[PDB]
Design a protein around this nucleic acid. Structure first.
Ligand SMILES: [Mg+2]
Ligand SMILES: [Mg+2]
Ligand SMILES: [Mg+2]
Ligand SMILES: [Mg+2]
Ligand SMILES: [Mg+2]
Ligand SMILES: [Mg+2]
Ligand SMILES: [Mg+2]
Ligand SMILES: [Mg+2]
Ligand SMILES: [Mg+2]
Ligand SMILES: [Mg+2]
Ligand SMILES: [Mg+2]
Ligand SMILES: [Mg+2]
Ligand SMILES: [Mg+2]
Ligand SMILES: [Mg+2]
Ligand SMILES: [Mg+2]
Ligand SMILES: [Mg+2]
Ligand SMILES: [Mg+2]
Ligand SMILES: [Mg+2]
Ligand SMILES: [Mg+2]
Ligand SMILES: [Mg+2]
Ligand SMILES: [Mg+2]
Ligand SMILES: [Mg+2]
Ligand SMILES: [Mg+2]
Ligand SMILES: [Mg+2]
Ligand SMILES: [Mg+2]
Ligand SMILES: [Mg+2]
Ligand SMILES: [Mg+2]
Ligand SMILES: [Mg+2]
Ligand SMILES: [Mg+2]
Ligand SMILES: [Mg+2]
Ligand SMILES: [Mg+2]
Ligand SMILES: [Mg+2]
Ligand SMILES: [Mg+2]
Ligand SMILES: [Mg+2]
Ligand SMILES: [Mg+2]
Ligand SMILES: [Mg+2]
Ligand SMILES: [Mg+2]
Ligand SMILES: [Mg+2]
Ligand SMILES: [Mg+2]
Ligand SMILES: [Mg+2]
Ligand SMILES: [Mg+2]
Ligand SMILES: [Mg+2]
Ligand SMILES: [Mg+2]
Ligand SMILES: [Mg+2]
Ligand SMILES: [Mg+2]
Ligand SMILES: [Mg+2]
Ligand SMILES: [Mg+2]
Ligand SMILES: [Mg+2]
Ligand SMILES: [Mg+2]
Ligand SMILES: [Mg+2]
Ligand SMILES: [Mg+2]
Ligand SMILES: [Mg+2]
Ligand SMILES: [Mg+2]
Ligand SMILES: [Mg+2]
Lengths: 76, 95, 101, 50
RNA sequence: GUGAAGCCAGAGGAAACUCUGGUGGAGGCUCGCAGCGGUUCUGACGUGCAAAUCGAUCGUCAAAUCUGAGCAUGGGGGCGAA
RNA sequence: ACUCGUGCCCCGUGUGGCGAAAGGGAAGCCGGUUAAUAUUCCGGCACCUGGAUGUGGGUUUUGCGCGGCAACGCAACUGAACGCGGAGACGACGGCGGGGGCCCCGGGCAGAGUUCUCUUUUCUUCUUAACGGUCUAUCACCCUGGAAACAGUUUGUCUGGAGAUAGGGUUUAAUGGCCGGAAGAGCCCGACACUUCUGUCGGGUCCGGUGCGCUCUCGACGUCCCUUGAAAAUCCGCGGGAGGGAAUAAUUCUCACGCCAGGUCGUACUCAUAACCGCAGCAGGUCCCCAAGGUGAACAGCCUCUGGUUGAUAGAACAAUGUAGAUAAGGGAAGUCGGCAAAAUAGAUCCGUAACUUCGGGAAAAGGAUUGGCUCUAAGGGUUGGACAACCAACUUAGAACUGGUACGGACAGGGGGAAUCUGACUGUCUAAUUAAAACAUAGCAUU
RNA sequence: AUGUGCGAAAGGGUCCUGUAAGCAGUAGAGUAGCCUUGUUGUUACGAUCUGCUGAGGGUAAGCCCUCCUUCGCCUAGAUUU
């Protein structure tokens, strides 16, 4: 697993051909939003502290790759 | 009615020893049909199988003794079995 | 001064007329300890009731909700309702009495 | 032991397969004289030499 | 537990080297648990739990200590702190 | 080097196999799952080796990066033969320091136990993997500078004009902090469905302290040796400089990302008062790992927690003789071949300690006193202010009063001692299953 | 097998031990935490001591007494002459 520092590198990674899926993990207790993208070798995580940038990044992400929202208590 | 298998499965499911597994005396026939870990979990959720609490073991007397020795109550010559150097090494004191 | 808020809710047994809220309140008066001494409420802890089968706890020290639960269990044992009533917590600072038998 | 060679494992397999009672329909054949498995082996009675 | 060299400080004296507090942590040293062994009861048992065990009491316990696996030496041969 | 395998050109001192499931060694962690397997299955998240060729990046175009005084740094940043070096790769022991885990203490949260009386109480939970990023972490090394009125410094040592103290840096070393993994997991509570099919949904999952503590690991020191405590496979660095490298195009790249593959055999279970060997379900024997609380010097004995058992043919009675465990008035070895057996002594603290001696010992010689409980007092540290005050933290020692059964290492645990003789110097070894000795060995001495 | 019966309790006696639990002090070496300038200032811990208390506990299992303490039991069942 690898942390991505900035939005530009995160979106550039999301544009990759091997990018399989992405998911948003919302931690309300910390007021944190994590964007996770699954590539071939590594899972890349970008951390944001506010919802405005999260929404703008979600709408600016490539539309081919699928996005999920990490439901609470994911089933086996 | 043999419930050794049920006791073993319940111990595995609950993550305790077989000596902490409680099986309902009045539901022996129902428990004997479990035979599977899914059914053991179902019986645990229904309350027919219960993990008994651990046996009490307190340190209150030890803590009381420690505080009494802090104020110097149980440390006379009749309470010492090791030598002075065994109780408090001169090398550690010098260091 | 910091203020901490606790609520003890005996609404169900109070309505069923088996729990004496005034007796419980006087029990806190005569049992809660401050600085290791009883009867030293000294306006740092105020334990008035709020009517709807609930007792309200203002503390200006590190008074603990478990001490409170311990005192509630002691009162239940004293008045012999342990076999039917139990003390539960579902959110921060609130302990209520529930029937279980 | 848990550590086994293939040869040892194969011989244990053969011994396990030979450890059985005789078929019932054998005793119904004409001229049959076999009453029971005379070469039966048990892990607690007779030790097999590898 | 004892406390070998080396080291610090202080006392004497003239010298040289005497002494006294400490520090240090040597030794096929020592008490003693496990392990290893097997002294005495000439105890138990003695058609036994056992073709050598059991109990108490004992020896040793930081190194000629205890021990696994692999390997070598084969019968007038081997191996032997004998 | 050719359409095509077969044409040549260089180097050469070597030129086998087997042999370790505890030696060396490429790489996997967590959660879940079965009646029985799981570091192998499932989910998530990784890594290594080998092979291929891409995209980006870097370097260059008569050439193969840049920075720093330096120690060295940075994402790469050509490099044949031939050679040099490193790693693999190493003893035992001692005290000290760092880290992980465990133990302990305080507060808080949730649950449980007790509650005639008392107890802000007793107990349990409160977790964070591999793999990575980032910042640090002793020793060492570099730069400035030039030390006696020598200084720095460890528990111990030691270090310095071959350059110390000091000031500033570089660097090996995470089982350290934070972040990703990762809360979505696990766990704990709480509340609503139900013949089953389906469970569903809420919340919470924290902060500090302490240490001659236990265990593992790492580090710097040190001691001992007429003892100096493997090898090889494999991997890396360098010296050298052979070949090769399109001003509008690839680029002999240890950089980032990406593609493909990883065969075979083992994997259940026991490992022992019933799964092995002793004819057996035999009180014997059989190599390891982990290792809680109290007392206490202590993996001593004794009690307890987790976990595991309650399995060893039973019932009744209580004769002799037994086996095992004890007690006995007065005498105290008169017993007996013989004090055999048993008893007596025993911890700790403080006094005191002869003959002899190889000066090291003898020695715990011999002997004597004290020891409980309670209430106090003093001393032994760190931090901050402004010589005192405040805050923080364990234990170790000493002194006093009071008190009772004149008792207190209250069980357990735990030397009897002395005066001599023979003998072997000592430590050590042997007749497995009747002899452990004065026998053997030993260092020393001597001879060949 | 109707008894001066048998048994189980209880009570009394005898005997052994040695003063129970609990409550209270002005008794307790002292200490602390708030105040009234103390003479008991009120409290809070405190081995122990004193009173209730020769108390409490045990007592036949091979101790004694109880025709009028209490609660039960009974003229069987089977075998042989
Ligand atoms: Mg010690
Ligand atoms: Mg020795
Ligand atoms: Mg032995
Ligand atoms: Mg004998
Ligand atoms: Mg006999
Ligand atoms: Mg023996
Ligand atoms: Mg004996
Ligand atoms: Mg081989
Ligand atoms: Mg190996
Ligand atoms: Mg896998
Ligand atoms: Mg998987
Ligand atoms: Mg590769
Ligand atoms: Mg390029
Ligand atoms: Mg080696
Ligand atoms: Mg401990
Ligand atoms: Mg705690
Ligand atoms: Mg973490
Ligand atoms: Mg310097
Ligand atoms: Mg995280
Ligand atoms: Mg959550
Ligand atoms: Mg170890
Ligand atoms: Mg440690
Ligand atoms: Mg297995
Ligand atoms: Mg056998
Ligand atoms: Mg055995
Ligand atoms: Mg202990
Ligand atoms: Mg202790
Ligand atoms: Mg112990
Ligand atoms: Mg078991
Ligand atoms: Mg038997
Ligand atoms: Mg006897
Ligand atoms: Mg006598
Ligand atoms: Mg006598
Ligand atoms: Mg005498
Ligand atoms: Mg005589
Ligand atoms: Mg005689
Ligand atoms: Mg004797
Ligand atoms: Mg004795
Ligand atoms: Mg001496
Ligand atoms: Mg002597
Ligand atoms: Mg003496
Ligand atoms: Mg005293
Ligand atoms: Mg004594
Ligand atoms: Mg001894
Ligand atoms: Mg000898
Ligand atoms: Mg030998
Ligand atoms: Mg012999
Ligand atoms: Mg012989
Ligand atoms: Mg012998
Ligand atoms: Mg009576
Ligand atoms: Mg009394
Ligand atoms: Mg009295
Ligand atoms: Mg009486
Ligand atoms: Mg007849």
């Amino acid at each position: 697993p690898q942390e991505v520092s900035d939005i530009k590198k995160f979106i550039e990674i999301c544009r990759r051909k091997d990018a399989s899926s992405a998911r948003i993990k919302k931690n309300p207790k910390t007021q944190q939003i994590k964007f996770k993208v699954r590539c071939q070798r590594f899972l890349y995580t970008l951390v944001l502290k506010d919802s405005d940038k999260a929404e703008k990044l979600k709408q600016s992400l490539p539309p081919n790759l699928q996005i999920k929202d990490v439901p609470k208590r994911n089933k086996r | 009615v043999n419930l050794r298998t049920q006791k073993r499965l319940a111990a595995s499911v609950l993550g305790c020893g077989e000596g902490k597994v409680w099986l309902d005396p009045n539901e022996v026939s129902e428990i004997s049909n479990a035979n599977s870990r899914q059914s053991i979990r179902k019986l645990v959720a229904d309350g027919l199988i219960i993990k008994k609490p651990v046996t009490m073991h307190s340190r209150s007397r030890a803590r009381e003794l420690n505080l009494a020795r802090r104020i110097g109550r149980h440390r006379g010559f009749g309470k010492r079995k090791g030598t002075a150097d065994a109780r408090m090494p001169q090398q550690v004191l010098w260091m | 001064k910091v203020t901490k808020k606790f609520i003890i809710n005996a609404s169900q047994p109070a309505s069923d007329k088996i729990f004496d809220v005034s007796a419980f309140e006087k029990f806190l008066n005569e049992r809660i300890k401050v600085d290791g001494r009883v009867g030293n409420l000294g306006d740092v802890i105020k334990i008035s009731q709020i009517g709807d089968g609930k007792v309200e706890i203002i503390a200006h020290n590190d008074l603990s909700g478990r001490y409170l639960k311990y005192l509630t269990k002691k009162f239940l044992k004293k008045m012999q309702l342990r076999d039917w009533l139990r003390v539960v917590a579902t959110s921060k600072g609130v302990y209520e009495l529930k029937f279980y038998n | 032991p848990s550590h086994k060679t293939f040869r040892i494992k194969q011989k244990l397999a053969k011994a396990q397969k030979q450890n059985r009672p005789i078929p019932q329909w054998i005793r119904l054949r004409t001229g049959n004289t076999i009453r029971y498995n005379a070469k039966r082996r048990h892990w607690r009675k007779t030790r097999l030499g590898l």
